[PDB]
Design a protein around this ligand. Structure first.
Ligand SMILES: O=[N+]([O-])c1cc(-n2ccnn2)ccc1NCCCCCCN[C@H]1C[C@](O)(CO)[C@@H](O)[C@H](O)[C@H]1O
Ligand SMILES: [Ca+2]
Ligand SMILES: [Ca+2]
Lengths: 87, 854
């Protein structure tokens, strides 16, 4: 019927199928293919933090067991349940 | 150092008497009519030909190619000391048989061969042979001396202003050993001296007496904080070890002479109790010694991370600022340390009411960062009627005592202090129970302990330690037990951290003083070093000499304790420390703050790079320590351990190995532009782990370096596991995937292991909850199998990447896993460096699997 496109890194170093975006392995040299995981050493994770200021944290602090965002969304599969503290 | 307050051998009366006996005809002789062959041992009477004193020799062949020699008085007025609690068990014996005899000689066979012991009667002598090769001789130079106990400086003796009442008179014992074919000896820590031990003929003997030496200097045989009476002898042909089980002050002489090295032990009291460990390989010696005194305690994973310490952090706010500084500057750190200023006026087990008013909340903040804390607890107790610890020990009579029956009082950090008798098991039980969460108020599961000054240090004591004539449990004098006082502290503390958790959590205790067997109880470090390039260099030979004698959890203060290191020195020390077992920065009270982010950015980055390398290698470090725990093999190794036939490696001490896989040559000179790295091994290849450049051995490679260079090479034929996702602490990383680094041999093969568990409990032993994986490469297939099937573990750890050095580009890469369909993995290949990277295998580390390169 139709089709689906691929993803390309923001530094143009490669182009990968979209099933390698957030697949917990670093494929882009700038880390742009893993914004929601801890796979890339130079990536960033975005805290939306509704009710406070939004924040960027290191990818290495995603699911490390430590509450970095006030909304707790950086810990979604680590065993640490973070309460919302954006107040 | 001020040398005047520490005795030379001439100022030690028993050393002077013994060392005045020179090689000659021994007056001791064996009375072969008294010979008896017991169930476990051979006993024969010895007699001094002039004094007619009668001794008893107890000779034992032991399982695992060991012989034990014990000599005591036949009928002593009072019993002599025999070192307890050091041997982990009664050594299993082997049967002795008489296989030859004449008028002056009896030949003995251990079991059914090939080891034989020839007892000569006149003069008394022992020879140890494998078949017809002479391994070792005892009393060949006739230096045996056994001062018997007489009727209660040979007696009353003074040093400086301190008086030894010496109520039992001269009781020293000594014995010599001949090592034919051996030209290199190692061991008997601790000394700020080279790895290969020097001859003592024209100078002082090596001294073994746990002492606190202020601003110790390098390249001299003065006794330092710990004493392990174990000497190793290595040659092209064989390895041997001598274990002199004596807890009193001991001097060791070394003389060379067809090539042969002679060793002579001289101790103040106790019996003669020596173990001959016959090898033949150095790893046989490791197994032999480990079966006697045990193996390295398996450290909790966090304690193999980076420790940040100094004397002192001011308060809880400072500790939390240090914690935040690591995260704000993207540097990993597992433990922050609290030196003596955290307590109430150096009353241990207490907290300063102003600067540490809420320790539980401080510990809770660190726990929320998944970090630990270490608090110092010294074994001197302030004499203070308001100090509950002092009142209990006083009321229960658990203090070391003087001859008049009163509790000994010395001077230390809190001023006047008394010293618990840690040789008393009731006192050790008291100490261990004091670490319960109800007794040590303010402590929490993430609080661990540092034992310092446990030589014991006594500021107003002789040689800054306890009087020789203090009295311990059972009436034994302090001179009998001195060198195991620290071990008892380390032991009771470690047991306390285990008991407080219900026997579940593994302890971490750092100790300054140590003895044979201290490896069972935690880590040691080389005390108060100095911020100088030569002190940096000497960390390698000092920890290596501790590794050879079973103490694998060793380190030196990163940056030096005294004085302020220049930024280049601090960078080089972080790189050196990052590849040594115990990894802690520490600093004197009056030094400038040197937390690693307080430096200029170029120095910060090299330090951060060194920290990242350390945390990535934690699976490798953890596996090396599991092998040390199971087999008794040291983690940090001299090159001659891995290359026993390369005689040019017998003295190397600016280079070391981690296991058999990594060769390290850290830069240890200011402004260096390169290093000379000796890559040993015939038909051996080495991979520069930074450039992936291959190098063939043997050669001395000149490697240019910059500030950020840490010369590390991976040996061909080895597989090294890494956590490439560095996080802020090891607790954050212990469920993360593994990257495998395969360094192909010239035969296209490689092998390696990986140990995993929960990281901090004894469940690996009580419930077999662990993983031991074997990784092996041959042909074009990488295979993962179980190296111990009894171990199972629930873990999310998987294999995210495989890096293969020395491989060509394949046409396809295929992965097979039990329970899964055959899968295809994408890959990347660099033709210049011959490095192959296999993308995302995605297989569980608990599963068997295989990757084939087509
Ligand atoms: O200057 N003197 O010779 C001297 C003489 C006397 N005195 C008293 C009566 N008579 N004489 C008293 C003091 C001193 N100087 C102090 C020496 C400093 C060296 C500390 C050793 N450091 C120990 C302890 C920690 O410092 C803190 O627990 C740890 O940080 C460290 O790791 C650990 O090794
Ligand atoms: Ca990806
Ligand atoms: Ca986090």
């Amino acid at each position: 019927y139709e089709e689906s496109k691929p993803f390309t890194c923001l530094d143009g170093t490669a182009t990968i199928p979209f099933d390698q975006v957030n697949d917990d392995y670093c494929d882009c040299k700038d880390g742009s293919d893993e914004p929601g995981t801890a796979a890339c050493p130079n990536g960033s994770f975005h805290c939306t933090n509704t009710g406070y200021k939004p924040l960027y944290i290191l990818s290495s602090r995603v699911n490390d067991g430590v509450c970095d965002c006030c909304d707790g969304t950086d810990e979604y599969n680590s065993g640490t349940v973070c309460e919302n503290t954006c107040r | 150092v001020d040398r005047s307050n520490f005795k030379t051998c001439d100022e030690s009366s028993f050393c002077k008497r013994q060392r005045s006996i020179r090689p000659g005809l021994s007056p001791y002789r064996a009375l072969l009519d008294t010979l008896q062959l017991g169930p476990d041992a051979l006993t024969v009477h010895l007699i001094h030909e002039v004094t007619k004193v009668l001794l008893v020799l107890e000779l034992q062949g032991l399982q695992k190619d060991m012989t034990r020699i014990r000599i005591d008085e036949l009928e002593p007025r009072r019993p002599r000391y025999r070192v307890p609690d050091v041997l982990v068990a009664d050594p299993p014996t082997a049967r002795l048989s008489v296989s030859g005899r004449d008028d002056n000689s009896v030949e003995l066979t251990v079991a059914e061969g090939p080891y034989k012991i020839i007892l000569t009667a006149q003069p008394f002598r022992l020879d140890l042979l494998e078949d017809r090769s002479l391994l070792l001789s005892v009393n060949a130079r006739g230096l045996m001396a056994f001062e018997h106990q007489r009727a209660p400086g040979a007696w009353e003796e003074t040093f400086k202003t301190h008086s030894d009442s010496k109520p039992y008179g001269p009781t020293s014992v000594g014995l010599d050993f001949s090592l034919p074919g051996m030209e290199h000896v190692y061991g008997i820590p601790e000394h700020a001296d080279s790895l290969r031990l020097k001859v003592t003929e024209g100078g002082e003997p090596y001294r073994l007496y746990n002492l606190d030496v202020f601003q110790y200097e390098l390249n001299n045989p003065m006794a330092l904080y710990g004493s392990v009476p174990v000497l190793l002898a290595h040659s092209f042909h064989r390895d041997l070890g001598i274990f002199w089980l004596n807890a009193a002050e001991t001097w060791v002489d070394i003389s060379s002479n067809t090539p042969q090295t002679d060793i002579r032990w001289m101790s103040e009291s106790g019996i003669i109790d020596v173990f001959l460990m016959l090898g033949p390989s150095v790893f046989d010696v490791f197994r032999q010694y480990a079966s006697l005194t045990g193996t390295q305690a398996l450290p909790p994973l966090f304690s193999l991370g980076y420790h940040q310490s100094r004397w002192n952090y001011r308060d809880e706010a400072d500790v939390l600022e240090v914690d935040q500084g690591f995260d704000d500057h993207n540097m990993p750190c597992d433990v922050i340390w609290l030196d003596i200023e955290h307590a109430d006026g150096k009353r241990y087990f207490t907290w300063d009411p102003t600067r540490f008013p809420q320790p539980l909340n401080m510990l809770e903040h660190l726990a929320s960062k998944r970090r630990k804390l270490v608090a110092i607890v010294d074994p001197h107790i302030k004499v203070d009627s308001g100090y509950r610890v002092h009142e209990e020990l006083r009321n229960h009579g658990l203090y070391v005592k003087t001859r008049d029956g009163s509790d000994y009082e010395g001077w230390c950090w809190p001023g006047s202090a008394s010293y618990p008798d840690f040789t008393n098991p009731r006192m050790r039980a008291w100490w261990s129970n004091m670490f319960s969460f109800d007794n040590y108020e303010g402590s929490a599961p993430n609080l661990y302990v540092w034992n310092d000054m446990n030589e014991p240090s006594v500021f107003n004591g002789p040689e800054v330690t306890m009087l020789k004539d203090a009295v311990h449990y059972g009436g034994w004098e302090h001179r009998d037990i001195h060198n195991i006082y620290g071990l008892y502290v380390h032991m009771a503390t470690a047991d306390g951290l285990i008991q407080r958790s219900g026997g579940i959590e593994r302890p971490f205790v750092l100790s300054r003083a140590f003895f044979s067997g201290s490896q069972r109880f935690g880590a040691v470090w080389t005390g108060d070093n100095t911020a100088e390039w030569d002190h940096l260099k000497i960390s390698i030979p000092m920890c290596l000499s501790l590794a050879l004698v079973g103490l694998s959890f060793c380190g030196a203060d990163v940056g030096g304790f005294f004085k302020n290191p220049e930024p280049e020195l601090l960078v080089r020390w972080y790189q050196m420390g990052a590849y040594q077992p115990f990894f802690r920065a520490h600093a004197h009270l009056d030094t400038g703050r040197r937390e690693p982010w307080l430096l200029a950015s170029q120095y910060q980055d090299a330090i951060r790079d060194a920290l990242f390398q350390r945390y990535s290698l934690l699976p490798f470090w953890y596996t090396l320590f599991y092998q040390a725990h199971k087999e008794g093999f040291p983690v940090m190794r001299p090159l001659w351990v891995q290359y026993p036939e390369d005689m040019s490696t017998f003295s190397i001490e600016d280079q070391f190995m981690l296991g058999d896989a990594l060769l390290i040559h850290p830069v240890s000179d200011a402004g260096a532009h390169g290093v000379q790295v000796y890559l040993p091994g015939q038909e051996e290849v080495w991979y520069d782990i930074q450039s992936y450049q291959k190098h063939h051995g043997p050669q001395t490679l000149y490697l240019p370096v910059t500030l950020s260079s840490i010369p590390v090479f991976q040996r061909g034929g080895t597989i090294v596991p890494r956590w490439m996702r560095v996080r802020r602490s090891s607790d954050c990383m212990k469920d993360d995937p593994i990257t495998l680094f395969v360094a192909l041999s010239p035969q296209g093969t490689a092998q390696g292991e990986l140990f995993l568990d929960d990281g901090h409990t004894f469940n690996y032993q009580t419930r077999h909850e662990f993983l031991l994986r074997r990784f092996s490469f041959s042909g074009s297939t990488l295979v993962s199998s179980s190296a111990d099937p009894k171990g199972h573990l629930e873990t999310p750890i998987w294999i995210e990447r495989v890096v293969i050095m020395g491989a060509g580009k394949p046409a396809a890469v295929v992965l097979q896993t039990k329970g899964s369909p055959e899968s295809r993995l994408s890959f990347q290949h660099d033709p210049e460096t011959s490095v192959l990277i296999l993308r995302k295998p995605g297989v569980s580390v608990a599963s068997d699997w295989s990757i084939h390169l087509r």
